[PDB]
């Protein structure tokens, strides 16, 4: 009978949409999950949606997910109060079943769920204070104290005095009464929190505005006899701007930095001003470029910019990354512009950084010497780099650092004779060449 | 104006002994709004 077929296969599809939507609910997916859920026929499946949300909450695989499930139920209760009403009936009845069973786990689950539904104004604080009064007439205090941790902020706002009275009763037991040691300590801790104020207990998924929740605050009491329409969980047979071409904005900041730089005697007070500005991580790349561009105007290198960059490095690793990235940017992209003079500035300026290890040294690996790929201007750059880097180390420490720095592409031992001829011939063209002996051996080994 | 800068203030009692370095800066010269001004020693290359 193809209407009974259609309506059954539609009911089945609705159930198997709702189940995986509930199973894929999280904070930061909740609003896409709620869209999808709203595109299912929630009203026809009202009991199917209630039973999946309860059974997921209650599966105790969750419990952590109770705040998420409560936020989903809050959204849905603004849309369709009849659904949130149904879900709150069954959850009350599940709490009272688990209390009477003495199932402490399902007490803890369902009580935490009622707590967060009250946090989201789905249900009235009356139900919480009645649950807590019932609990506190027996011990059950592990239950009562978890509940009060998870509602107790909202209870203090809405109903200070009743809550206060309960605390007085709760307080009364601890000071003048005998209790099991494990139970008491948890009981005391809640007492500690009251002085603390619950400041690890007011954080979550408030993803409806206090007027966009159409605030159907359902006034249940946990001693009604209620309905819970399990039967709606059967199958049945329903016969029913401007583009920016100008950096002038960045030009302002450029003049502010350059002006900070031209003031400030010594170097060590200029680092103070620059670090004082607290530059956002985005810009701390370019500020370096301003520094060096300025250093190229000075017509001669100065220890100033060296000690400046050194005092700037050691403060924060973002400046490490800054100078490294700018080293690659300079050597790779930007060298082709500079005349042989400004190269005399750059060579020493990076020499002081490398020889004292601030750079660090292995970042020299970018350099590769080939007739095919090199810049003669860049060649001069290397010349000044090592000719500065020697004078501080003295060609002694140089060989040790290099030999321990595993520079490969620059110092080929693997083969390619002609390249080794270019390397050795090059360092002998610098006027040093004493780094090339190990390669000279490989010449005779190749021949 | 060569006097704005900032002046290293470090540790009167110790700087008689170690040369502690520059641990602090006393304000060199003042203003209503700060702005900044360049100072000569920056515009003349060092002897070295």
């Amino acid at each position: 009978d193809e209407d009974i077929k259609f309506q059954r296969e539609n009911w089945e599809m609705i159930r198997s949409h709702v189940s995986p939507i509930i199973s894929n609910l999280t904070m930061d997916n909740l609003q896409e999950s709620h869209r999808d859920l709203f595109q299912v026929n929630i009203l026809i499946g009202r009991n199917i949606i209630c039973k999946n949300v309860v059974d997921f909450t209650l599966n105790k695989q969750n419990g952590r997910l109770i705040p998420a499930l409560s936020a989903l139920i809050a959204l849905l209760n603004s849309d369709i109060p009849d659904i949130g009403e149904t879900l709150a009936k069954e959850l009350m009845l599940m709490f009272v079943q688990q209390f009477n069973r003495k199932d402490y786990v399902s007490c803890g689950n369902i009580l935490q769920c009622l707590s967060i539904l009250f946090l989201y104004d789905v249900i009235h604080e009356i139900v919480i204070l009645q649950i807590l009064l019932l609990l506190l007439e027996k011990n059950s205090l592990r239950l009562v104290i978890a509940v009060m941790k998870i509602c107790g902020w909202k209870l203090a706002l809405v109903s200070k005095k009743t809550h206060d009275m309960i605390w007085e009763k709760l307080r009364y037991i601890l000071q003048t009464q005998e209790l099991s040691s494990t139970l008491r300590e948890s009981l005391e801790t809640l007492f500690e929190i009251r002085q603390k104020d619950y400041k690890s207990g007011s954080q979550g998924l408030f993803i409806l505005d206090p007027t966009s929740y159409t605030v159907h605050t359902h006034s249940y009491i946990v001693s009604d006899e209620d309905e819970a329409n399990k039967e709606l969980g059967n199958f049945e047979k329903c016969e029913n701007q401007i583009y920016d071409m100008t950096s002038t904005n960045d030009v302002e900041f450029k003049k502010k930095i350059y002006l900070v730089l031209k003031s400030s005697l010594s170097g060590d007070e200029a680092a103070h001003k620059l670090l004082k500005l607290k530059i956002a991580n985005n810009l701390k790349k370019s500020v370096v470029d301003i520094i060096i561009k300025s250093s190229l105007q000075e017509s001669t290198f100065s220890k100033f910019y060296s000690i400046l960059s050194e005092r700037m490095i050691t403060f924060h690793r973002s400046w490490q990354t800054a100078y490294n990235e700018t080293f690659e940017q300079n050597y790779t992209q930007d060298i082709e512009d500079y005349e042989t003079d400004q190269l005399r500035i750059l060579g020493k300026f990076w020499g002081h950084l490398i020889s004292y290890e601030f750079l660090p040294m292995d970042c020299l690996k970018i350099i590769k010497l080939t007739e095919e790929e090199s810049c003669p201007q860049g060649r001069i750059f290397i010349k000044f780099l090592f000719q500065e880097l020697v004078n501080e180390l003295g060609l002694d420490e140089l060989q040790l650092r290099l030999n321990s720095s595993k520079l490969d592409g620059m110092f080929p031992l693997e083969g390619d004779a002609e390249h080794i001829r270019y390397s050795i011939n090059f360092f002998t063209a610098i006027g040093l060449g004493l780094l090339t002996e190990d390669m000279r051996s490989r010449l005779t080994i190749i021949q | 104006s060569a006097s704005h800068i900032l002046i290293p203030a470090s540790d009167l009692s110790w700087s008689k002994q170690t040369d502690t370095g520059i641990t602090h800066f006393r304000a060199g010269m003042t203003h209503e709004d700060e702005k900044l001004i360049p100072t000569i020693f920056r515009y003349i290359t060092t002897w070295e």
Binding site: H272, F315 | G21, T23, F25, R26, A27, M29, T30
Partner: peptide, 27 residues
């Protein structure tokens, strides 16, 4: 706090006697 840095007082020094820690050299 005045730790022994600064001036005995700022009167004849013409400055503001404003002292501030140096972010530059620490580690």
């Amino acid at each position: 706090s005045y730790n022994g840095i600064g001036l005995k007082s700022a009167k004849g020094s013409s400055t503001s006697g404003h002292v501030q820690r140096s972010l530059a050299s620490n580690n």
